[PDB]
Every structure is written in C-alpha cells, then in structure tokens.
Amino acid sequence: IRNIPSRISIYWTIVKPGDILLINSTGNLIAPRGYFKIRSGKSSIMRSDAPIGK
Amino acid sequence: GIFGAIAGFIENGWEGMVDGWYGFRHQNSEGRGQAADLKSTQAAIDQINGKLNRLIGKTNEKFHQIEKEFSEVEGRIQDLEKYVEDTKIDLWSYNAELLVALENQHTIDLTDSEMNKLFEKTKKQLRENAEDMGNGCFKIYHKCDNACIGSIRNGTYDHDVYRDEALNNRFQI
Numbered sequence A: 001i002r003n004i005p006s007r008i009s010i011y012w013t014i015v016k017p018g019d020i021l022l023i024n025s026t027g028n029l030i031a032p033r034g035y036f037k038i039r040s041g042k043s044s045i046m047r048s049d050a051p052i053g054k
Numbered sequence B: 001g002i003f004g005a006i007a008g009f010i011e012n013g014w015e016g017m018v019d020g021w022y023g024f025r026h027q028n029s030e031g032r033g034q035a036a037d038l039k040s041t042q043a044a045i046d047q048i049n050g051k052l053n054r055l056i057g058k059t060n061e062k063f064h065q066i067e068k069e070f071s072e073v074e075g076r077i078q079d080l081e082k083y084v085e086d087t088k089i090d091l092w093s094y095n096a097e098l099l100v101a102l103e104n105q106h107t108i109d110l111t112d113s114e115m116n117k118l119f120e121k122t123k124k125q126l127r128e129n130a131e132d133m134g135n136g137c138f139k140i141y142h143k144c145d146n147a148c149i150g151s152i153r154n155g156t157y158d159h160d161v162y163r164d165e166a167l168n169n170r171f172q173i
C-alpha cells in the first residue's frame, strides 16, 4: 500500500478512574503519546458528499 | 359521508361561496341572496387545525444510531442491522398510511356532521313555519323579507310572529 508491504494494527483501551494502564512489550509496540478524553452526548457521524451551507 | 348531508341530500356544494364553508341561500319577494354562517365554518376549521396541531411541527430528535449503509458483505451482524431498520421502517410506514386513511375518513364525516347540525338547528328555529323540501332547503310559508331572512341566520327569528300566517298557508286546501 503506497509501496509499503508491512502493516500496523490499531487497538484501543478505556481506563476508568482508580484503574491503571499497563503496557508490557518486547517489541513491535506502536506507543500512544497520551489519551483522548471520552464524553457522552448527542454527537454522531454521517457519510455524505453534500456541501456545507451557511 | 356518514351523516348524508354532504354528497347526500345536499345535491352539491356552492363554488360561489368563498367567505365560509357553510351558509345560507334564500329566495323571497325581494330577491335571492347568500350569506356564510361563521360559527359552523369555524367549528369545522377548529377541528381540522387540531389534527394539524398534533401532526405539524412535532418531530422527534434522534442522534447517534446504527449504520444503515454498508460497503462490505458481513453476514450475521449486518443482516440484523438491516432487518432492524426495515422492520422499523415498515411499522412507521404502516401507522402513517392508517393514520391518514383514518384521519381523512373522520374529517369528511365531521364536516358532513357540521353541515347537518346547521340544517337541524335551522329546522328547529322555523318550528311549524317551514317545511323541509328534502334537498336541504326549506319552503317558508309566509312573507319573509331580508330582515326576516337575516333573523333566521342571526338566530333571533321569532316563530310566534309568523305562526298564524304560516299555518294558514301550510294547511290550506
């Protein structure tokens, strides 16, 4: 793909308060630089090619 | 349809009545004329606006849901998402078809109802002073000028004033 025969597989992990992230690795780790905040609410996603209007 | 006034004993509607839904046409010694009846028209309108009020501008907010289009074949999980959506779509579609058929049936009938009520009210006012000619019109058996006609429409007609006169005319030989 774009001249690259190797691959990366992406995973995710949610960590609750009072809990702890533990990473044990002996190679091939593609490390996170941090975390995303996760919220709840009315948000969503839609696939569309319609232009945005004012 | 169900009361049998509109599309019934009333042969047809009057296209020239543009200032109300129900009203009166008369003929007398001074001529023939027309006036809308405001209260019956409004009664019908009020009922129809009520339906609209339940239906117009009352949509439900939905946000994140499930996906409904798919670029890859996936089987079991995908079948269910599609089936869930089709099932949902079919049921909402059913309620709407049924809703409109039902609403429409009730509206023609309620409008038929309002026409009949105005006829019936009119019938009662005239007491023994008029006879039902059978097509929604009354033959009034006394001299009845514009003021007289106006009084019937205005609900102030005094049957006692004309009763003697009318009876002589009705029960002639």
Ligand SMILES: *[C@@H]1O[C@H](CO)[C@@H](O)[C@H](O)[C@H]1NC(C)=O
Residues within 6 Å of the ligand: B154, B156
């Ligand atoms: C009904 O008749 C009464 C008595 O004359 C009068 O006061 C009133 O104006 C009439 N109503 C209408 C709307 O013609």
